Amino acid sequence: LQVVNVEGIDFATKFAPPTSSTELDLIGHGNTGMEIETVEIRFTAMGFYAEPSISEHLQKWKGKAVSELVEDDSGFHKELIQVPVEKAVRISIIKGIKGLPYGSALQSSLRDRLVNDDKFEEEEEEALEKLVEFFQPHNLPKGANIIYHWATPDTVKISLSEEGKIPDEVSYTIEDANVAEALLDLYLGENTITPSTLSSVAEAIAA
Amino acid sequence: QVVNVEGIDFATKFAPPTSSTELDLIGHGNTGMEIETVEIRFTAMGFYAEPSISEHLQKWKGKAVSELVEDDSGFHKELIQVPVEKAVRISIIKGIKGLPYGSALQSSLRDRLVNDDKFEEEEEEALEKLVEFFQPHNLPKGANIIYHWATPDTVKISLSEEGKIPDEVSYTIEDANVAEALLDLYLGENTITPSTLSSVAEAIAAQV
Amino acid sequence: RAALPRAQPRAEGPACVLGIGTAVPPAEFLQSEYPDFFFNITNCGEKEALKAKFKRICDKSGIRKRHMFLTEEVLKANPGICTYMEPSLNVRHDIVVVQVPKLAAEAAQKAIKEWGGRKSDITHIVFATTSGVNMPGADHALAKLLGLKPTVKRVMMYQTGCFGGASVLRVAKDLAENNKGARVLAVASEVTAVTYRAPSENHLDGLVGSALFGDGAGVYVVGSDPKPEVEKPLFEVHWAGETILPESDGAIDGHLTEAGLIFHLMKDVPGLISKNIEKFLNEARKPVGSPAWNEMFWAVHPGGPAILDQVEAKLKLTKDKMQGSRDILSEFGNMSSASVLFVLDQIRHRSVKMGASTLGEGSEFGFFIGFGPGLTLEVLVLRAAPNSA
Amino acid sequence: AALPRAQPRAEGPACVLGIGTAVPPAEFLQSEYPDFFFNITNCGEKEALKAKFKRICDKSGIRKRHMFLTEEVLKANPGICTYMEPSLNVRHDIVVVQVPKLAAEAAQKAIKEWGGRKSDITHIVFATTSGVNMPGADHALAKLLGLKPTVKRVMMYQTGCFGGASVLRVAKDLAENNKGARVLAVASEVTAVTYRAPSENHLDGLVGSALFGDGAGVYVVGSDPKPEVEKPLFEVHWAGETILPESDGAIDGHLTEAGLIFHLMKDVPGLISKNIEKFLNEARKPVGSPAWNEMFWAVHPGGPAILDQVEAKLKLTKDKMQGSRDILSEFGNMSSASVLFVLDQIRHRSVKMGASTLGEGSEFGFFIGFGPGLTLEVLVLRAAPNS
Structure with a gap:
C-alpha cells in the first residue's frame, strides 16, 4: 500500500515530485529492456505517476480489455498523453551507463518523433542539444534516479540523483512544448520504449 | 672504490654475475640529449674491462684524446677488438618500458649490421629474440642492465628492475656479429654515448 | 594557368x-x-x-x-x-x-x-x-x-x-x-x-x-590492373558504400576505460539490421544489374547467430547463402573486423570444394557486409572470378 | 568480361x-x-x-x-x-x-x-x-x-x-x-x-x-570544381610519406590508465633536418623540381627547433617559415590540426601582401607533417592565382 516492487526496486505508491505540493499516484510501472541471444537485459525500472483525477478523464476506457487500449489506432495513447493533470515518470537505472550516451539516446528518440510529426525545427533542435548538455557531465550508475515532472503539459522539470537517493531539487527544466510532449510520447505513445509500463497504466485505467 | 656517475655510485672494481674475473672501470658517462633547451639523461653508463686492456692499447698511451676519439683514428675498432673480458653497466635514469628499449636496440644493431653487410636471417632472428627477452620487462628509474662479453662472440645480459646489482644471468646473445655490433653501439665512432667513449679514451691516454 | x-x-x-x-x-x-x-x-x-x-x-x-x-x-x-x-x-x-x-x-x-x-x-x-x-x-x-x-x-x-x-x-x-x-x-x-x-x-x-x-x-x-598470367584476381570490387540505420542511434557504445574496453548494447541489433538492410542492398546492387538475392553470394560478418538468421529470413535466402558465414562463426566465433575477411575466403574454399563455376559458389556478384556502432552498415559489391586453376 | x-x-x-x-x-x-x-x-x-x-x-x-x-x-x-x-x-x-x-x-x-x-x-x-x-x-x-x-x-x-x-x-x-x-x-x-x-x-x-x-x-x-560556382584555393598534386633513417624509437606514445604519455628518445629536429631534403627532392620532381626558395612551406610547427634547423639546412629565406612561425606564436603546437592552420595563414599572408598566388607568389609548395616513426608526410600543392 506504501510501495510497489518494480524489478527489485521499491517505488512509492504516492509521491510529490521535487519542489511540488501536488501528490501523484502510481498509475503503472514497468521496465525498459530487451532480449539478446537468449538473455533478458533490464535497462531501467519505471513508474508513471499522475494526479488521482486522471481516471475521471478516461472514463470511456473503463471496463474495456487492455488489448483494446494498447492496440494501434485505439486513440488511448494520445488521450492519456493529453489528459490535463500533473504527471511524472520515475526512472531507476539498472544497467549503469554514462550521462552522455543516455542524453544522446533521448535526443535521437525525441528527434525521430518530432520529425515524424513535422515538428522538428531549429528551436526543438536547440532544446534537445541543451538537454544532452545537461546529462553529459553526469554518471548514471546502477541505482541512479531520474524524475521527469510535467507540472504543466509544456514543461518538464528534471531531477537527478546519481547516488540513488530521491532528489529534492530540480536540476533542469525542458521549456519547449513540443519536446515536452514528445518525451511523454516516448513512454506512453504507440511506439513506447516501455510497452510494459504502458500496459500497466492501461490495466489500471480499464479496471 | 666508487665513482659517481650522474649521481649513481659505480664501483671501480666489478666482477659480472657468475664471473670470477674482476674488471676495472675504464670509463663512465651517460646517454642523453637536449630538447627545446632542456637536457635529458636517459642512463648512466660504465665501461669495465680486465686491467690488461692498457697493455693492448700501448700505441695510444701519451696521445691526446682528440686523436683517439676522432673519426678514422682506428682507436674505436681497436678498443672494440681487444681480447679481454669487457662489461657495460647501464643504470636507467629515464624509466621506460622493456619493449621500446629492446626494439630500439634492435633497430640500432640492425643499422650497424646492414651497413657492414652482416645482416642475414641468422642475425635477424637473434635480434628478434633479444627484443622478446626485453619486452615483458619494465625498466623504471634505477634499473640496472649488465652486458658482459666473457668471449667476444657472446653477451651475457643481467637485469634488475628494482635497481640491485643482479647476481644471475637472464639472457645470452649467442650471435658473434650481434655481440660485436652491441659493443660498437657504445664504443664505435657513432656511439650513442660519446661521453663514455671520451672517458675511456682519456684513461687510456693518461698513462706513461 | 593551364x-x-x-x-x-x-x-x-x-x-x-x-x-x-x-x-x-x-x-x-x-x-x-x-x-x-x-x-x-x-x-x-x-x-x-x-x-x-x-x-x-x-x-x-x-x-x-x-x-x-x-x-x-x-x-x-x-x-x-x-x-x-x-x-x-x-x-x-x-x-x-x-x-x-x-x-x-x-x-x-x-x-x-x-x-x-x-x-x-x-x-x-x-x-x-x-x-x-x-x-x-x-x-x-x-x-x-x-x-x-x-x-x-x-x-x-x-x-x-x-x-x-x-x-x-x-x-x-x-x-x-x-x-x-x-x-x-x-x-x-x-x-x-x-x-x-x-x-x-x-x-x-x-x-x-x-x-x-x-x-x-x-x-x-x-x-587494379592485374598483370596477365602473373597475377590472378579472385574478386573484383565494383561498389563500396555505407549508411547509418534509421532509429538505430545509440544501439552500441564502446568506452575505452582504465579497465579496458567496455561494450554497452542498448538496442536490438539483429532487429535493426534485418529491418533496414534490404532497402540499402537494393541500391547497392543496381550498378551490377540488380541480380536477385538468391542469384548472389553473401560474405556477411557473423556478428552472431541471430543476425544471420533474421537477415536470411527477411531476404528469403536459400539456406546455402549464409553457410560461409556460419562456417566462420562455428570455427572462429566473432573476430570483430577480421571475421568478414575470413567469410569471403571460406566462400571461395566452398566454391572450389563443390566445383562451382565461380569463386562465389556459382553466383557472379555478391555482397561483402560489415556492421557495427552507429549503427553503421558497410556494404561492398563484388564480382567473383571464374573457378579455373 | x-x-x-x-x-x-x-x-x-x-x-x-x-x-x-x-x-x-x-x-x-x-x-x-x-x-x-x-x-x-x-x-x-x-x-x-x-x-x-x-x-x-x-x-x-x-x-x-x-x-x-x-x-x-x-x-x-x-x-x-x-x-x-x-x-x-x-x-x-x-x-x-x-x-x-x-x-x-x-x-x-x-x-x-x-x-x-x-x-x-x-x-x-x-x-x-x-x-x-x-x-x-x-x-x-x-x-x-x-x-x-x-x-x-x-x-x-x-x-x-x-x-x-x-x-x-x-x-x-x-x-x-x-x-x-x-x-x-x-x-x-x-x-x-x-x-x-x-x-x-x-x-x-x-x-x-x-x-x-x-x-x-x-x-x-x-576534384573538378564547378566553374563560376566553386573556387579552388590549392590543388593537391602529390602525396607521400617515409620513415626516416636511424629514427626508429624516436617517439613513443603510450595510452595508459593515466592518459597519454610521450617519451622522446632521440633528437627529432636533428633527425628531420638531416633527412628531409633527400625526400623533398623526390617529391618535387612531378611538378618540375622548382628550387626551395621558389616554393611555399606549410610546415607543421612542432617546435621552434625543428623550424629553425630545417630552415638552416635548406637555406630558406626567413619568409618561408613565417606562416608556420605565426601559427606557433598564436596557437602553439595543435598536433594534427596545426599544419591545416599553417596553409590557411600562408593564404592570409598572400592576400595581405598582395602576392600573385595564395602561396605568397610561389606556384608550388609543400604541406608537411611529422610524427612517431619517425614518419615524414609530404604533399605537393599548387597555389591558386591571387589578383
Missing part, C-alpha cells in the same frame, strides 16, 4: 583481391567447455544463475570453438584482466601492441604468397583493429615485421568495431584504383585482451561479447 | 575548396603559463623544475595557446592535475564531446567558404590524437553537422603530429576516385588526454606541456 596531367598516375580497372591470408592464435577453446573455464579463471564459480545464463548464450551461439591468445598461463600472469573493473589497461596494451601486428604479419605473409608478387611492391597498408591503440601504430609495427619499403603509405583505422573489415576494403578500393601499380595490404587483426572481462550480473549484455568474441587476422592484397 | 567503372571516377586533381579553423575560447599567455601550470598541479614548490620549464616557455616561440582546460575544468577533474593517478575515464569524458564539437565549428566555416551545401558532402576523413571512442568522432561530427546517413568515413585515431597531412593524403584519393565527391578533411585536437603534472622524472614531458595547445582545422576537398 591544367597539368595527373602527377601520380591513376589505375584503370577495378580494384581486385589478388591474394588472401588468415591467421589465428594457436590455443583453441571449445565452446562446450568455455563456461567452466571462463567462470573458474575469473573466480565466479559461485554465480550459478549467472553461469546458467552464460551457458544458454553459448549453447545458442552457433560457435564450436574460438582461438585466443589469452590462455590460462597468460590470464594467470595478468590477474587484473580476470577482474570485473580493476585498473588493467596498461597490462592489456602490453599484450595487444605486440600480438595485433604479429598476427597480422602472419596473415600477410600468406596473402603475399598467394598473390605471388614481392613485398617491395607493396605500396600501401590499410589496417583496422578494435584491439587497443599505440604510437607508433600497428600499421608501422606491421611494416617493420614484414620489412616493407620505408615509403609505404599507411591508413591506420583504430577502434573500428565489427564493420572494420569492410572499411579496409573500401579504403583499399580507392587507394588502388587511384594509383597506377599500387598494391595494397588491407588488414584486419583482432586480439580480445582489451575487451576480456569477468562476468557480472550488472553487465548482462557483456555476457554476449564474452560468448562470441574470438581472435584472428585477415589480410588481402588489393590492386 | 570487363565492365565500366561502376562508381564513376573524377578527372582533375583534388582541390582545397574551403578552409575553416576553430579553437577553444580561453587564451593562456605563455609568459604567465609556468606560474599557472605549476600552481594548478600542486608543484609550486619545485623551484628548480619550474625554472627549467620557464626556460622552455621563453624559447618556445609561443605567445599564447588556446585550451579547453580552464582552471574551472581542472579543479572539476583533479585526477588530470596529478602526475600518474588513474584518470583516463575523466579525460575521455572531456575529449569525446570537445573533439567533434570543435571540428564542427571549423567545418561550418569551411563549408561556408566552399559555398556548397552540406548534403553534398560525401566523405569524412578525420584525424586526432585526443582520445578514442565508439562510435567514433567521425560519426559524432556527421550528426553534429546533419550530414546524410550515407556519408563514407575514414577515422584515423591516435595519429600524432603527422595526421593533418594524413587526412589530406586520404582525401586526395577519395576525391579523385569518385565523381562529384566532396570530402571533409578534418583534424581536431584537445589536450585533455596528454595534460600532465610536471616531474623531474619526465623532463621530456615538460616539452609537451610547453608546446601543446588545442584546435581544429577542416578542409572541403574535391
Whole structure:
C-alpha cells in the first residue's frame, strides 16, 4: 500500500515530485529492456505517476480489455498523453551507463518523433542539444534516479540523483512544448520504449 | 672504490654475475640529449674491462684524446677488438618500458649490421629474440642492465628492475656479429654515448 | 594557368583481391567447455544463475570453438584482466601492441604468397583493429615485421568495431584504383585482451561479447590492373558504400576505460539490421544489374547467430547463402573486423570444394557486409572470378 | 568480361575548396603559463623544475595557446592535475564531446567558404590524437553537422603530429576516385588526454606541456570544381610519406590508465633536418623540381627547433617559415590540426601582401607533417592565382 516492487526496486505508491505540493499516484510501472541471444537485459525500472483525477478523464476506457487500449489506432495513447493533470515518470537505472550516451539516446528518440510529426525545427533542435548538455557531465550508475515532472503539459522539470537517493531539487527544466510532449510520447505513445509500463497504466485505467 | 656517475655510485672494481674475473672501470658517462633547451639523461653508463686492456692499447698511451676519439683514428675498432673480458653497466635514469628499449636496440644493431653487410636471417632472428627477452620487462628509474662479453662472440645480459646489482644471468646473445655490433653501439665512432667513449679514451691516454 | 596531367598516375580497372591470408592464435577453446573455464579463471564459480545464463548464450551461439591468445598461463600472469573493473589497461596494451601486428604479419605473409608478387611492391597498408591503440601504430609495427619499403603509405583505422573489415576494403578500393601499380595490404587483426572481462550480473549484455568474441587476422592484397598470367584476381570490387540505420542511434557504445574496453548494447541489433538492410542492398546492387538475392553470394560478418538468421529470413535466402558465414562463426566465433575477411575466403574454399563455376559458389556478384556502432552498415559489391586453376 | 567503372571516377586533381579553423575560447599567455601550470598541479614548490620549464616557455616561440582546460575544468577533474593517478575515464569524458564539437565549428566555416551545401558532402576523413571512442568522432561530427546517413568515413585515431597531412593524403584519393565527391578533411585536437603534472622524472614531458595547445582545422576537398560556382584555393598534386633513417624509437606514445604519455628518445629536429631534403627532392620532381626558395612551406610547427634547423639546412629565406612561425606564436603546437592552420595563414599572408598566388607568389609548395616513426608526410600543392 506504501510501495510497489518494480524489478527489485521499491517505488512509492504516492509521491510529490521535487519542489511540488501536488501528490501523484502510481498509475503503472514497468521496465525498459530487451532480449539478446537468449538473455533478458533490464535497462531501467519505471513508474508513471499522475494526479488521482486522471481516471475521471478516461472514463470511456473503463471496463474495456487492455488489448483494446494498447492496440494501434485505439486513440488511448494520445488521450492519456493529453489528459490535463500533473504527471511524472520515475526512472531507476539498472544497467549503469554514462550521462552522455543516455542524453544522446533521448535526443535521437525525441528527434525521430518530432520529425515524424513535422515538428522538428531549429528551436526543438536547440532544446534537445541543451538537454544532452545537461546529462553529459553526469554518471548514471546502477541505482541512479531520474524524475521527469510535467507540472504543466509544456514543461518538464528534471531531477537527478546519481547516488540513488530521491532528489529534492530540480536540476533542469525542458521549456519547449513540443519536446515536452514528445518525451511523454516516448513512454506512453504507440511506439513506447516501455510497452510494459504502458500496459500497466492501461490495466489500471480499464479496471 | 666508487665513482659517481650522474649521481649513481659505480664501483671501480666489478666482477659480472657468475664471473670470477674482476674488471676495472675504464670509463663512465651517460646517454642523453637536449630538447627545446632542456637536457635529458636517459642512463648512466660504465665501461669495465680486465686491467690488461692498457697493455693492448700501448700505441695510444701519451696521445691526446682528440686523436683517439676522432673519426678514422682506428682507436674505436681497436678498443672494440681487444681480447679481454669487457662489461657495460647501464643504470636507467629515464624509466621506460622493456619493449621500446629492446626494439630500439634492435633497430640500432640492425643499422650497424646492414651497413657492414652482416645482416642475414641468422642475425635477424637473434635480434628478434633479444627484443622478446626485453619486452615483458619494465625498466623504471634505477634499473640496472649488465652486458658482459666473457668471449667476444657472446653477451651475457643481467637485469634488475628494482635497481640491485643482479647476481644471475637472464639472457645470452649467442650471435658473434650481434655481440660485436652491441659493443660498437657504445664504443664505435657513432656511439650513442660519446661521453663514455671520451672517458675511456682519456684513461687510456693518461698513462706513461 | 593551364591544367597539368595527373602527377601520380591513376589505375584503370577495378580494384581486385589478388591474394588472401588468415591467421589465428594457436590455443583453441571449445565452446562446450568455455563456461567452466571462463567462470573458474575469473573466480565466479559461485554465480550459478549467472553461469546458467552464460551457458544458454553459448549453447545458442552457433560457435564450436574460438582461438585466443589469452590462455590460462597468460590470464594467470595478468590477474587484473580476470577482474570485473580493476585498473588493467596498461597490462592489456602490453599484450595487444605486440600480438595485433604479429598476427597480422602472419596473415600477410600468406596473402603475399598467394598473390605471388614481392613485398617491395607493396605500396600501401590499410589496417583496422578494435584491439587497443599505440604510437607508433600497428600499421608501422606491421611494416617493420614484414620489412616493407620505408615509403609505404599507411591508413591506420583504430577502434573500428565489427564493420572494420569492410572499411579496409573500401579504403583499399580507392587507394588502388587511384594509383597506377599500387598494391595494397588491407588488414584486419583482432586480439580480445582489451575487451576480456569477468562476468557480472550488472553487465548482462557483456555476457554476449564474452560468448562470441574470438581472435584472428585477415589480410588481402588489393590492386587494379592485374598483370596477365602473373597475377590472378579472385574478386573484383565494383561498389563500396555505407549508411547509418534509421532509429538505430545509440544501439552500441564502446568506452575505452582504465579497465579496458567496455561494450554497452542498448538496442536490438539483429532487429535493426534485418529491418533496414534490404532497402540499402537494393541500391547497392543496381550498378551490377540488380541480380536477385538468391542469384548472389553473401560474405556477411557473423556478428552472431541471430543476425544471420533474421537477415536470411527477411531476404528469403536459400539456406546455402549464409553457410560461409556460419562456417566462420562455428570455427572462429566473432573476430570483430577480421571475421568478414575470413567469410569471403571460406566462400571461395566452398566454391572450389563443390566445383562451382565461380569463386562465389556459382553466383557472379555478391555482397561483402560489415556492421557495427552507429549503427553503421558497410556494404561492398563484388564480382567473383571464374573457378579455373 | 570487363565492365565500366561502376562508381564513376573524377578527372582533375583534388582541390582545397574551403578552409575553416576553430579553437577553444580561453587564451593562456605563455609568459604567465609556468606560474599557472605549476600552481594548478600542486608543484609550486619545485623551484628548480619550474625554472627549467620557464626556460622552455621563453624559447618556445609561443605567445599564447588556446585550451579547453580552464582552471574551472581542472579543479572539476583533479585526477588530470596529478602526475600518474588513474584518470583516463575523466579525460575521455572531456575529449569525446570537445573533439567533434570543435571540428564542427571549423567545418561550418569551411563549408561556408566552399559555398556548397552540406548534403553534398560525401566523405569524412578525420584525424586526432585526443582520445578514442565508439562510435567514433567521425560519426559524432556527421550528426553534429546533419550530414546524410550515407556519408563514407575514414577515422584515423591516435595519429600524432603527422595526421593533418594524413587526412589530406586520404582525401586526395577519395576525391579523385569518385565523381562529384566532396570530402571533409578534418583534424581536431584537445589536450585533455596528454595534460600532465610536471616531474623531474619526465623532463621530456615538460616539452609537451610547453608546446601543446588545442584546435581544429577542416578542409572541403574535391576534384573538378564547378566553374563560376566553386573556387579552388590549392590543388593537391602529390602525396607521400617515409620513415626516416636511424629514427626508429624516436617517439613513443603510450595510452595508459593515466592518459597519454610521450617519451622522446632521440633528437627529432636533428633527425628531420638531416633527412628531409633527400625526400623533398623526390617529391618535387612531378611538378618540375622548382628550387626551395621558389616554393611555399606549410610546415607543421612542432617546435621552434625543428623550424629553425630545417630552415638552416635548406637555406630558406626567413619568409618561408613565417606562416608556420605565426601559427606557433598564436596557437602553439595543435598536433594534427596545426599544419591545416599553417596553409590557411600562408593564404592570409598572400592576400595581405598582395602576392600573385595564395602561396605568397610561389606556384608550388609543400604541406608537411611529422610524427612517431619517425614518419615524414609530404604533399605537393599548387597555389591558386591571387589578383
